Homo-oligomer: A and B are copies of this chain.
């Protein structure tokens, strides 16, 4: 599927990756968020941003103890107050 984050069109083709500001495989210190796609389920880990799924704020987490949140509302994900659209 494709991730639209304001400006950005990004594709996600194999269970996920890291969202840079302007999908990367490695977690650099300039990536905002981590995506996982498995068995038709979408998960987001917050690294360095303000992240919302509907009314839920996604707590940031470190790479050795990741907190990956099931995206229970694929239509209300926000990152840094910018809407994210997923489309297959």
Contacts and interface: CB of A to CB of B under 8 A. Distances in A.
Q: How many of these chains are in the complex?
A: 2
A43 B72 contact: no
A39 B55 CA distance: 11
Which size class do A's interface residues fall under? 10 to 19
Interface string A52-82: 0100110101011111111010000000000
Residue among A38, A43, A57, A68 having the largest count of chain B Cβ atoms under 10 Å = A68
Nearest to A61: B68
A4 interface: no
A41 B64 contact: no
Interface of A: 38-39, 41, 43, 53, 56-57, 59, 61, 63-70, 72
